[PDB]
């Protein structure tokens, strides 16, 4: 790996990713004897344990090509299982800010990335694991958190106008917005992984407390990885 | 509708959906006082009960354009719930014939059907109804029924040659191949509606019994669609 | 064969294929001594004679991958030839019902069955074959029936919204929308079969026992190419 | 028009179209008082009388985008009906040198010319004018000239490497290949004008007064249909 | 070759390509003992020399499938440097008639021959020699001509309709539109020439003697470019 | 702003970006009195002087949509002229490990960030600013560093497989491969930015204290041009 630098058996099977790596710092607190196992590029990669398992909570950085590259390395270091936790925007009214979206799939402009993978224009179904999603719902449930489930659609362009945004993806059966998830799924089916995502609704584009959100959502994410 | 003639309140609620006439004329022997609803252009509908609720078993026919017309023609009947009951084709060699395929996701590749409906390339998720598919699995785990979950590939052209057809598609994450997923999860999520799919394995492409194994899925399925 | 169960010569060389099993049992009575040789799927297949030349009536079902699958299946029993004969929804004015379009080529939206089987996105003419297209002209005129020659396009999204469709497919050529002609066209060049298509106007998107008269009569006309 | 400086009424509404301007000049010599009305950028266009019929010779270039500002700029000064007389490589081993192929359809890759005047990537069919192509037909067989019926591929990249070129197009049901029939035909759909095309065999990818013979019989089974 | 029918010899590495054959004839005479080496299919080749260089002025048609025939060939015979000097249209309101565009890139629509020269829909950087480039901005100043230094719209539809045409493509970095600079600069990334372009603005889609005056200043420029 | 957290006025109108937190700390050294202005997500981004003039080193983190939302943040807190400074892969032999590429143009897949912005799949020109890009050939030039000009290929996928990756890219006339420049470059163009990249080569796929020094080095003629 030329970007994470961790050496070979500091990075677990089992990794909570994160886009931004102030989060994977936070969030280390929640992990027994958290150690650094990488710096560079700003990928801050923490390893320690949770619930009896060893766990590790990595930083992907923003897009598809980013968390492609961090993917592909924590993978070449041990990791196979992956659940990605975020922010999003959510696509629809009835969601409040600080509930959860627990994502069934990704819908996402075929690109560069895709293409380069699949090596064609096919609409390879871009979905979580199964199992890996139900335990996310159980471990959700268990600390009664308020989720829903849907799909959501992975953005390239944060910034690009779209006048018709909100109808055009929501009457697409998503119900709310990010960049990774797509990526996330469909290069997991690809390499094996097993990976699954939950996102925090931090803005509604249809329509401390954020803080506890984040923490309360990333120990039902730790559950569900060490279960 | 011009397809499927039934008159008004012959169509319910919950519908199960399957290719063959002669499939769904057969499983009309599980509901109670089974009634000919449609006829015509061979798409056979039957109405009657089942576990105290009133269902359809429809004919779709085979690929995306003709089950399109059935799903749009049932729903401006009354019909919102889908659950599509057909046989496959494995990509994966650990899957015994007879045993079944809950659908998870639907990879397809692009073409005229998902264009005029989706009015661009976007790879819309093609997703069947998370609640309804844990169902399924829950109504075939319940029937002691073997089955895996996971996507399917589904094609446009039976016959068109593939020389790495199994490959291809296997490293897609698809362990199956049919012709009408797809379509029926995309529509639906456009639509509003909630559908699902399970399938008989009839082939492996990697590598009376069969009979039975069709009579015991169905029942499962009526148990999902009736719970 | 997977769909189509029929034995070793129980298939005609020459094939009038139509979507809905309910035209080719109906037209299966303007043949002699017709013997019912597939029903399975639904996929109603009928051997007689006409004109005391053997003949098929075929149900293909609707859709390009239907169709598709139905004449990759009829060729593996011997069937070479192939008119389709169904019905279709005008996009121009001029046009009245229970008239005749006899079909030149078809437009088709790019992708599914068409990348599977010509491996890229190219735009491969699709097109009946010139003989037999002049030969269904000879007949219908023949007949005295009245009916268009030209393009139609063919649609794979029966429901599909689009507030510009008449003026969008007329413009670019298309006479009338219907869903098979474009794989039966294209299929058909790439795997050596003779292929035509005459269609029945049920329907004018730009405007009973009549529609079956005129489905009668056209089917006549239809049945004397096949066995000229 | 910037092009075609040719003014109004000097362009009659049959037109026969060419690529080489010399092939203009020598078939102009097959008018009744043949008279140049534009030589601007190359593009020779003649206009004279034949079988009392007023007619122009004019000189479209090499590829789509070429033949798609002539042919537009000849409709603006009054013409509707394009005949295109050309050069093509047979696909099949059949066809011999100087034999002559009646065009049915174009296949082409999307892109470019078609993205732009059809405003996406849709598969519109390009065919040409099927009575006008009838006709051909009927001239070529009535002056005894050896014709094959069928589609082509036009191609925008004449030197492009394909390495299973022949054995590709050939399969997807084109005889021949060549670099304007496609922009040809369905611009013509699209503006309403009446097209259709004949192309001189000139090499075979399957297999010199011999040929200028073959080039002017055919021309003159073009311009007999041209005016009838 | 088959269209350019020069010998080996009479092409000189360094080629001025120009789309209209009447302005290759004019710009000979800019060249001394300046001798006509092709007139096939319109293409008139000039070659003599100037600056104590031998360079060759060549005609090549309209549109991308044309020039990149003439490139191939004239290739063929031994070109290796290209520099097209064209008319284009302004995409902006502070291009005066007259003034020129010295060329950085071209936007491009994809398909046809770039896919098959690509092999895929890939967008490849379609951009000029730089070192090529920078010594056309020298001779131009050095001569004291008013240039601008941008991208430019290779269209293949000179009438294609498009409502937001100027805004669009000018919003999108290009600040005029013609249509060979897409494919020449392309098919010399791939073939490994050196190409550039400089374009007279003959229109302003923003907003004779001069013109000639115009065309002849930029052609002297563009020639002490190619001899340097 | 969303992801830079800075105030108004602390942002420089001349920025030069990097990838790497790691290096913009780095070259955060080579200025006057450097201030911290942001730090959020990661991506640092340091304003102080060089030769007496302002400017900022930001990060803009991997891929385009990465840079994409960086540029455009940037941009609405007063930014407007980029320059990227990272590494890369030469796709060439002949080009040496810790030498510079200065960009002329970037190559690309479509899809993804360009539909998005473009609304639709045309091959915008992503070039960088002619002007600027020469004031960096100067400035390395200047400083007896060793470089190239030329086109990379932005690539979106690190680690996917292609077993003729070297040779495509490089027969398409790229020297070089990354995965920021096109979106920089035709994001500039459609927002009205100057930007220009030069690239350190970390390693060569047609083939520390070095590496540093070779960053260092190239950093000051960077900075030498973005206060020029």
Redesign the interface.
Known sequence: PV?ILAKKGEVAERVLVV????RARLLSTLLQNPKLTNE???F?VYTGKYNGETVSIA?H??????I??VL?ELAMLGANVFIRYGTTGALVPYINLGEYIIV???????????????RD???????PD??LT?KLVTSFSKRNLKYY???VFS??????E?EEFVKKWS????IAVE?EC?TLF?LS??KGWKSATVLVVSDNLAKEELEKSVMDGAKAVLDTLTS
Chains 1, 2 share one sequence.
Do not use: W
């Open positions: 970007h886009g931004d790596p102030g560079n590029r700003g801050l930083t950085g923003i897009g598809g090509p980013s492609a590259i592909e069934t799939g990704a819908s996402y402009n075929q690109g560069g990335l895709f293409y380069q993978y699949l224009n096919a609409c390879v179904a871009s979905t199964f199992e139900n489930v849907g799909n953005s390239d362009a944060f910034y690009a779209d009457s697409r059966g998503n960049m797509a469909t089916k690809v």
